[PDB]
Point group: C8
Chain length 123, copies 8
């Protein structure tokens, strides 16, 4: 298959929401390939609407996955290294999937020289 | 368990509040699967609100947990690496769960050229950037 | 036990101050569980007052602990790795327990293009 | 293949869009070498424009790929290190390919001295910095 | 030693000033335990002031110490890792003990779009954020 | 050779563009040494023009090289470590060769205390 | 060689310009020791100026060198670690030798609350911070 | 010895300038101990003047030392790890000894949403 199909598009948004890579999703019988999906994302606004929201839901699923991957890692050097890579890749991806929710968080206390007021000169 | 059940949702909130992760909670007897929990959240504002409170409590619980994970790690190379991964994952998650409390903390002393005042020159716009 | 008790709350603030994880504190006979303590922290202002101050005192104790953990680490690969994890976890926690005291410290010398004045255009 | 051939350039764009890297594409039967592709880009705006679109698509493809590389890594020390390198290289490249989408994301809560307002003192210029 | 004893507090300050850590000091003959030292600090402003001066001196002492720890490390994998941990712990602590002297140092050359001026557009508030 | 030569300067800009270190370029028979090239870069504007552009083209070549070095790394500990060093060195260099294109990319959402407006006091 | 000798100072500048480090230069036949070079610099502005130019050239030379060190590293664990150290040391040094050219490069897209405008509230000073 | 002595203070500033840790300096026969030196640094301005300048000169010596430590490292795992620690400690220290010269260097291109102008609203 390679034609637009709302029922499969919906199907796509569903699996995505649960956390599964799009790669692992399109890899199902009767589903559009990855390239086609990205094509649809340019000729269907109704799709780009269900897709971004699906991506934020996917992120929320992945957030809970990282605890499991870490806590259930097999206590062998290479398996722990793999678990770390799986977690690190997810952490990095989460920030991009929902920057407001999963981006880095910093509080910067801004002060001036010697803890006094910030000194500015203007021309 | 597919239909929304407040009593079960309440239990989920209590377990999360204590520091347990969602996927682990969902493995307990009679719990809904994670996908179902997410569906419940989506359609029940009462659950969403209690879940948000549980997440705050969850973070405070995890903050204490990381000390235990580190201090009690089995002194074996792989076990220590696993403990480190568990702690690092929690540290990252805490900042997201409560950014105000658990985000990074930096004090930036801002000075200018040669440790004097910050020098700023303002000029008329030179391109149409408005 | 699971009822409010100022004498045990005080007891809590005490052990906390010396550096001991709350987890290790509530784990004593006759003490409220962790969950209960966090509950009290919502129905007692007199508590939230002794608790935040206890936390800052706890931080000061932990600050001295990291030197000991580092300096007295057993010189074996895994024990040193564990010591490093114990220290790193404490460093990260200290910044959250007292951000003013234990947060990161940076001095930023702000200059403009080529070391000249910072150039701004406004619209 | 030295002369600019649109049909071949179009194929290159499709292959890149799917996530394949340029040097790997150029090893396929009948493809120009990388230096030739760069020469084509330099002198053909039609190719440059389609190549820019292909790069955006390439990034979206790679974003999905990194999950697979990590999750499917052979649990051997060297193979995991290689998978990590492949993922790290892609992460770095993604931010450059589409900075808006794949750049780092930070929220900075800006406060002043002792958690109060940011204190700013302005003064007449003291040196000729204009 | 439970009661505040100035002579002992003074010795503590001298030992800290030389670079010794508090827990190590408290193991010396006739020293109070750390909890007692903290109690003394809490209730004696004279000790607090001298302790603050000792902390500044302590930092300067540690700054020199880190060179020795690194340079004299036994060239064994575990011993080098331990030396690294001792040095890293001190580096982190120094920045807190005297932020002005031992904090990170960065020069940020600030420029705007395409290396020109920083472009700023100001607009009326669009939401009630005051 | 050690005299100015536009045909060799051109030759230089060519090899550079394809990604090859200048070190590896001057190492060809009849070519000026590295030191001489840097000298020319001070007495020929026509050169400093072809050189900076050559450097940006070199960067674009190196960008594609890093994928190959990573993906084709021999799966042996030391070879992977070497591949990582080769890639890391290139990543660092790319940012300097074309900062606009290859520099770090950050989006900073700037907010004030507790997510409110940024609070400023002026004197 | 203790007395300032311009011919020797000139040679030092040429060698540094080519990428050689000072301590290595000072080991060559007839060279002054490093302490002497520093003394020459301190008291001879002509040498200081030529040395500053040599440092710029040195940096450009090292920038090319790091590619060679990485690419030619012997694929042995210790040799690769040493090559990494040599490259990392040079990267750090380059940024100091020519900050404009070799410093870190970042583009910061600055936005405000919820991706809208940066919200700024100005208020009268509330403490004597002037 | 433990009395103020300009000739030894000078002697101190000398060795410091060449790069040698103060610890390694005071460790010479007839020299004040470390603690005494820090005491002098509070009762002699003529000293605090020769000392800060000595520190900047010390930094310049250390800067050249790091190349040697890196390039001449013995190619054994632990020796390379030690060399790395020696270099890292020096790099960190250099930034504190002369922040203007040895601090981190960053160029920040500041732009607004989507590469447009930085958008500000004021109240």
């Amino acid at each position: 298959p390679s034609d637009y199909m709302p029922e499969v598009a919906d199907d796509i948004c569903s699996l995505l929401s649960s956390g599964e890579s799009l790669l692992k999703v399109c890899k199902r019988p009767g589903m559009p390939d990855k390239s086609t999906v990205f094509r649809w994302l340019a000729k269907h606004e109704d799709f780009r609407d269900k897709y971004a929201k699906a991506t934020e839901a996917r992120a929320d699923s992945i957030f809970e996955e990282i605890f499991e991957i870490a806590d259930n890692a097999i206590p062998d050097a290479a398996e722990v290294a793999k678990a770390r890579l799986r977690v690190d890749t997810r952490k990095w991806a989460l920030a991009r999937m929902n920057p407001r929710k999963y981006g880095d968080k910093v509080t910067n206390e801004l002060v001036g020289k010697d803890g006094g007021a910030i000194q500015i000169e203007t021309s």
